[PDB]
Design a protein around this motif. Structure first.
Motif, PDB file in Angstrom:
ATOM      1  N   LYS A   1     -70.814  57.616  79.280  1.00 23.44           N
ATOM      2  CA  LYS A   1     -69.905  58.647  79.778  1.00 23.44           C
ATOM      3  C   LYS A   1     -68.844  58.986  78.734  1.00 23.44           C
ATOM      4  O   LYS A   1     -68.560  60.157  78.487  1.00 23.44           O
ATOM      5  CB  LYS A   1     -69.222  58.187  81.067  1.00 23.44           C
ATOM      6  CG  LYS A   1     -70.097  58.209  82.308  1.00 23.44           C
ATOM      7  CD  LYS A   1     -69.297  57.754  83.519  1.00 23.44           C
ATOM      8  CE  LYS A   1     -70.141  57.730  84.780  1.00 23.44           C
ATOM      9  NZ  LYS A   1     -69.325  57.312  85.961  1.00 23.44           N
ATOM     10  N   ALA A   2     -68.275  57.948  78.124  1.00 21.00           N
ATOM     11  CA  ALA A   2     -67.232  58.089  77.109  1.00 21.00           C
ATOM     12  C   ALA A   2     -67.720  58.820  75.858  1.00 21.00           C
ATOM     13  O   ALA A   2     -67.037  59.709  75.359  1.00 21.00           O
ATOM     14  CB  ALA A   2     -66.668  56.723  76.742  1.00 21.00           C
ATOM     15  N   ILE A   3     -68.893  58.433  75.359  1.00 22.23           N
ATOM     16  CA  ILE A   3     -69.492  59.059  74.175  1.00 22.23           C
ATOM     17  C   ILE A   3     -69.784  60.541  74.435  1.00 22.23           C
ATOM     18  O   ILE A   3     -69.486  61.395  73.598  1.00 22.23           O
ATOM     19  CB  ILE A   3     -70.782  58.313  73.725  1.00 22.23           C
ATOM     20  CG1 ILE A   3     -70.431  56.927  73.170  1.00 22.23           C
ATOM     21  CG2 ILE A   3     -71.553  59.127  72.690  1.00 22.23           C
ATOM     22  CD1 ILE A   3     -71.598  55.955  73.117  1.00 22.23           C
ATOM     23  N   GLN A   4     -70.353  60.832  75.604  1.00 28.00           N
ATOM     24  CA  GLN A   4     -70.608  62.206  76.039  1.00 28.00           C
ATOM     25  C   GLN A   4     -69.359  63.084  76.022  1.00 28.00           C
ATOM     26  O   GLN A   4     -69.391  64.210  75.521  1.00 28.00           O
ATOM     27  CB  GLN A   4     -71.217  62.212  77.445  1.00 28.00           C
ATOM     28  CG  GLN A   4     -72.677  62.655  77.516  1.00 28.00           C
ATOM     29  CD  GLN A   4     -73.557  61.986  76.482  1.00 28.00           C
ATOM     30  OE1 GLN A   4     -74.266  62.657  75.726  1.00 28.00           O
ATOM     31  NE2 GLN A   4     -73.512  60.660  76.432  1.00 28.00           N
ATOM     32  N   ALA A   5     -68.265  62.557  76.566  1.00 28.41           N
ATOM     33  CA  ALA A   5     -67.044  63.334  76.747  1.00 28.41           C
ATOM     34  C   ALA A   5     -66.204  63.449  75.480  1.00 28.41           C
ATOM     35  O   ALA A   5     -65.493  64.441  75.291  1.00 28.41           O
ATOM     36  CB  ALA A   5     -66.219  62.761  77.881  1.00 28.41           C
TER      37      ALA A   5
ATOM     38  N   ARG B   1     -58.194  67.038  64.039  1.00 29.40           N
ATOM     39  CA  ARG B   1     -59.404  66.317  63.638  1.00 29.40           C
ATOM     40  C   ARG B   1     -60.487  66.356  64.714  1.00 29.40           C
ATOM     41  O   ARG B   1     -60.217  66.110  65.890  1.00 29.40           O
ATOM     42  CB  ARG B   1     -59.071  64.861  63.295  1.00 29.40           C
ATOM     43  CG  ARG B   1     -57.996  64.687  62.231  1.00 29.40           C
ATOM     44  CD  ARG B   1     -57.551  63.237  62.147  1.00 29.40           C
ATOM     45  NE  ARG B   1     -58.492  62.413  61.391  1.00 29.40           N
ATOM     46  CZ  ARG B   1     -58.395  62.173  60.086  1.00 29.40           C
ATOM     47  NH1 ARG B   1     -57.395  62.693  59.384  1.00 29.40           N
ATOM     48  NH2 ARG B   1     -59.297  61.413  59.483  1.00 29.40           N
ATOM     49  N   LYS B   2     -61.714  66.653  64.294  1.00 32.50           N
ATOM     50  CA  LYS B   2     -62.871  66.681  65.188  1.00 32.50           C
ATOM     51  C   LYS B   2     -63.579  65.328  65.129  1.00 32.50           C
ATOM     52  O   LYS B   2     -64.108  64.943  64.086  1.00 32.50           O
ATOM     53  CB  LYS B   2     -63.814  67.819  64.781  1.00 32.50           C
ATOM     54  CG  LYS B   2     -64.948  68.101  65.754  1.00 32.50           C
ATOM     55  CD  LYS B   2     -65.707  69.352  65.333  1.00 32.50           C
ATOM     56  CE  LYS B   2     -67.016  69.502  66.093  1.00 32.50           C
ATOM     57  NZ  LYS B   2     -66.842  69.841  67.527  1.00 32.50           N
ATOM     58  N   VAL B   3     -63.588  64.609  66.251  1.00 30.12           N
ATOM     59  CA  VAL B   3     -64.041  63.214  66.251  1.00 30.12           C
ATOM     60  C   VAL B   3     -65.545  63.025  66.449  1.00 30.12           C
ATOM     61  O   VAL B   3     -66.212  63.829  67.101  1.00 30.12           O
ATOM     62  CB  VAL B   3     -63.247  62.324  67.254  1.00 30.12           C
ATOM     63  CG1 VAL B   3     -61.748  62.483  67.036  1.00 30.12           C
ATOM     64  CG2 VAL B   3     -63.622  62.632  68.697  1.00 30.12           C
ATOM     65  N   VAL B   4     -66.058  61.951  65.858  1.00 30.44           N
ATOM     66  CA  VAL B   4     -67.423  61.503  66.075  1.00 30.44           C
ATOM     67  C   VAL B   4     -67.370  60.253  66.958  1.00 30.44           C
ATOM     68  O   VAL B   4     -66.732  59.260  66.607  1.00 30.44           O
ATOM     69  CB  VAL B   4     -68.140  61.198  64.732  1.00 30.44           C
ATOM     70  CG1 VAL B   4     -69.574  60.775  64.967  1.00 30.44           C
ATOM     71  CG2 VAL B   4     -68.100  62.413  63.811  1.00 30.44           C
ATOM     72  N   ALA B   5     -68.012  60.332  68.122  1.00 28.15           N
ATOM     73  CA  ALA B   5     -68.125  59.206  69.042  1.00 28.15           C
ATOM     74  C   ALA B   5     -69.594  58.847  69.203  1.00 28.15           C
ATOM     75  O   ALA B   5     -70.411  59.692  69.579  1.00 28.15           O
ATOM     76  CB  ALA B   5     -67.511  59.553  70.388  1.00 28.15           C
TER      77      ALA B   5
END
Ligand code: CL
Ligand code: CL
Lengths: 214, 211
Positions: B179-183, B192-196
Motif C-alpha cells: 500500500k505504501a509503495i503504491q501511494a 523532489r520526486k521520490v522512488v519507493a
C-alpha cells in the motif's frame, strides 16, 4: 609485535577509523554481556594477525557507544560489517567458526589481484559533449602511451530518480598493463580541457564481463 | 505478457526510461547459445509478468547500442532498473541459474517484503533529528511502522564520491508495505520526486542496507 592489532572504536572515532580508512575494515558490533561476542573475540584476534596487510579488524562496543549501530540497522549482536573505501561491502550476523569467517572474508576481499590493461577516465566529458568523433579522438590520443584495443564511451545514471544526473566514464583498454600504467601516470590529475580528469585502473575481469559500473 | 523487440532508436524509451525492471538480451540469429536461451527467456517473460519485462536487441540489425555497454560475446544479458544497470550476465544460462540471477538482483521477486526503501526524498544536508519521526508519522497512514532507518551511503569507492540518503521503512506485514509503495512511488516532496520500492527483507534483517 605481538601487541593488539584491533582498532578500538568510539562513536567520535568511527568516521576517521572506518569510513576514511585505507583498505578493508571488518567492524564488530558487540557488548560485554553478549555471549556470542566473546565466542568470536579470540577468532577476531587470529584473523587480525593472519589478515595483516589486507584487512584491519575494528570493534565498537554498543553499550559505551550507542550512536553508531542504529545508523547501520544493527539488530542482534555480534554483527560484522565489512567496509571497503567508505562502503559497506558485506555483512555477517551472529557468531561463526574461524573457518566460516575465513570463507566469508575470502569471498568478500579482492581475489586474483592484478594490474589491469583497462584505464577509466572520469570527469572529462559531459554527456552532451559526446559526438561521433570522441571515441576516435580518445584512441588516437591514448595511442601515444601504447596500443589501444578498444575505447568505450559509457554513460551512467547516478540515481533512480527520473532526472538523476548522467555522467560519462571513458574506458581505454590497452594491449598490455605496462601501457595502461604509463597512460594513467601521464593523464591523472591533468586538465582536458577545462575539466580535471581522474585517470585510474579499472578491474579487468569486470570489463571483460561487460560490467562498467565500478 | 511477451518480449519487447528493441531497436537502436527505441532503446532509450523501451529500456532506460521504462517503468519496472527490464532484462535486455543482446543476440543474433547465427548465435547458437542465444537460441539455447530463447525458450528459457519465454518462460521468464510469462512467469515474471508485471515484475519484469524481457527485451531483445539483435546486434546485427541494431549495431549501435551494444558497444555502448561494452558488449563483447553473445548472448549477454543486462538488467535495467530506473535507467541504471543493476546486473550483467555473459553467456548461456539454465532456467534455474537465471532465476538465481533474478532472485539476487530483483528486489521482491523471491519474497514480497515488509521493507520499503525511499530513494531521492532528502539530501544529507537536510537530515535532522525530526526526520525519522516525520517519516513514521507519514508512513503510519499505510499500516504499523516497525522501524524507520535514515541511511547515508557513499556512492562509489573514490573519496570524491557523493553521499546519498536511503530511507528504510519496515512495516509489520507485506500488505501494508505494498500500500505504501503504491501511494508513495513517483510522488513529489518539496521539489523532489521520490522512488519507493521493495527492499529485500533478508538483506534488511541481516543489516545489509547497500542494495
Ligand atoms: Cl572495544
Ligand atoms: Cl503527486
Amino acid at each position: 609485535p605481538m601487541s593488539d592489532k584491533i582498532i578500538h572504536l568510539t562513536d567520535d572515532s568511527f568516521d576517521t577509523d572506518v569510513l576514511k580508512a585505507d583498505g578493508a575494515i571488518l567492524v564488530d558490533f558487540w557488548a560485554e554481556w553478549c555471549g556470542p561476542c566473546k565466542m568470536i573475540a579470540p577468532i577476531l584476534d587470529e584473523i587480525a594477525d593472519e589478515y595483516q596487510g589486507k584487512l584491519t579488524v575494528a570493534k565498537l562496543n554498543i553499550d559505551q557507544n550507542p550512536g553508531t549501530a542504529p545508523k547501520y540497522g544493527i539488530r542482534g549482536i555480534p554483527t560484522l560489517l565489512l567496509f571497503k573505501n567508505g562502503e559497506v561491502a558485506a555483512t555477517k550476523v551472529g557468531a561463526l567458526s574461524k573457518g566460516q569467517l575465513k570463507e566469508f572474508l575470502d569471498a568478500n576481499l579482492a581475489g586474483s589481484a592484478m594490474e589491469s590493461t583497462v584505464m577509466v577516465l572520469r570527469n572529462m566529458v559531459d554527456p552532451k559533449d559526446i559526438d561521433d568523433d570522441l571515441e576516435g579522438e580518445v584512441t588516437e590520443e591514448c595511442g601515444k602511451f601504447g596500443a589501444v584495443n578498444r575505447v568505450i564511451i559509457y554513460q551512467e545514471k547516478q540515481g533512480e530518480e527520473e532526472d538523476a544526473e548522467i555522467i560519462v566514464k571513458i574506458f581505454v583498454e590497452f594491449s598490455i598493463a605496462s601501457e595502461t600504467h604509463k597512460a594513467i601516470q601521464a593523464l591523472n590529475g591533468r586538465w582536458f580541457a577545462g575539466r580535471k580528469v581522474v585517470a585510474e585502473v579499472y578491474d579487468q575481469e569486470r570489463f571483460d564481463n561487460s560490467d562498467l559500473s565500478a
